[PDB]
């Protein structure tokens, strides 16, 4: 909408107060004009029609329980925009400052969140498996990263290419979580998953097997569920990324860690310069080796560590 840029204040899903960029024209809207062509947050009103209504508020204060998922969807989309711009010189998900749209209160008791090819969509959860999913910065950044993938490698969402697609989203979701630097970890979704259970998460990148996911290519799933295991076999790539960054010994193979920043540079270059819609795990290894070679040199520790990490998870 046309209006003047304003700054509201509210509370997110976890009860934390934050400022949000709004737009004033009769109402105060969740429309942040400070980033690209805008960040716009919508109310789906417990229905499944999308996007719903641009979020309107009478007083620029967002402290109601109903407001909390919208506050966090809007704010964390801003953090994710800032990460891609400041760290990777990428302007929004298309590289041309495309408007970022999100809808909250999708359906009733909906235990998921997703990028749909056009926008972000967040369920509220049923209060037992999930609380409103926009409360997790890694969740927001994971799903926005699918938009980056759509405009770059275009990894088809099935089998090995789909597991790479998922892992790329977990990797950058985690790197955005570290960028914001509030309780960062190598787990996925811990801030919104199972409010009654402490210390768990949806997936672990440091130890995928904690939640039944494979940490070695010899344990890959080859059935048809989950689009051929895209959220299962992602553990193999997530573990390799964790090893590249943090180092460790895994199935007797030692990896020299190179840190999160270099992990992000290597995988961002692989995603935007080398991966294709049909890339498999072996081709990801080659893309990561080439990306590290471009950035650090063929004789570098960075290249050696990429090879060690893929060796450790059984991907040649």
């Amino acid at each position: 909408i046309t209006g003047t840029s304003t700054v509201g204040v509210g509370r997110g899903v976890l009860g934390d107060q934050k400022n949000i960029n709004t737009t004033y024209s009769t109402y105060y809207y969740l429309q942040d004009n400070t980033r690209g062509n805008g960040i716009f947050t919508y109310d789906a009103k417990y229905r499944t029609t999308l996007p719903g209504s641009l979020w309107a508020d009478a007083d620029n204060q967002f402290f109601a329980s109903y407001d909390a998922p919208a506050v966090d969807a809007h704010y964390y989309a801003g953090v994710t925009y800032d990460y891609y711009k400041n760290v990777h010189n990428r302007l929004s998900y298309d590289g041309n400052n495309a408007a970022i749209r999100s809808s909250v209160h999708y359906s009733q008791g909906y235990n998921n969140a997703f990028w749909n090819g056009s926008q972000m969509v967040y369920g509220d959860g049923d209060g037992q498996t999930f609380i409103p999913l926009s409360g997790g910065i890694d969740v927001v950044a994971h799903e926005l990263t699918h938009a980056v993938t759509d405009y770059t490698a275009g990894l088809i969402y099935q089998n090995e290419s789909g597991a790479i697609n998922e892992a790329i989203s977990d990797i950058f979701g985690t790197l955005v979580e570290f960028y914001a630097n509030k309780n960062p970890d190598w787990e996925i979704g811990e801030d919104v998953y199972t409010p009654g259970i402490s210390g768990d998460s949806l997936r672990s990148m440091s130890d995928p097997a904690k939640y039944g996911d494979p940490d070695h290519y010899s344990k890959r799933y080859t059935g048809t569920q989950d689009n051929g295991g895209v959220h299962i076999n992602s553990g193999i790539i997530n573990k390799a990324a964790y090893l590249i960054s943090q180092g460790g010994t895994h199935y007797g193979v030692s990896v020299v860690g190179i840190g999160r920043d270099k992990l992000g540079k290597i995988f961002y270059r692989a995603l935007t310069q080398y991966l294709t819609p049909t890339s498999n795990f072996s081709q990801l290894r080659a893309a990561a080796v080439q990306s590290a070679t471009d950035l650090y040199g063929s004789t570098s520790q960075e290249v050696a560590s990429v090879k060690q990490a893929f060796d450790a998870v059984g991907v040649k």
């Binding site: 969140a113 997703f114 990028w115 994971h142 799903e143 699918h146 569920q225």
Partner: peptide, 5 residues
Amino acid sequence: GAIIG
């Protein structure tokens, strides 16, 4: 369906 299957 995307954060989880």
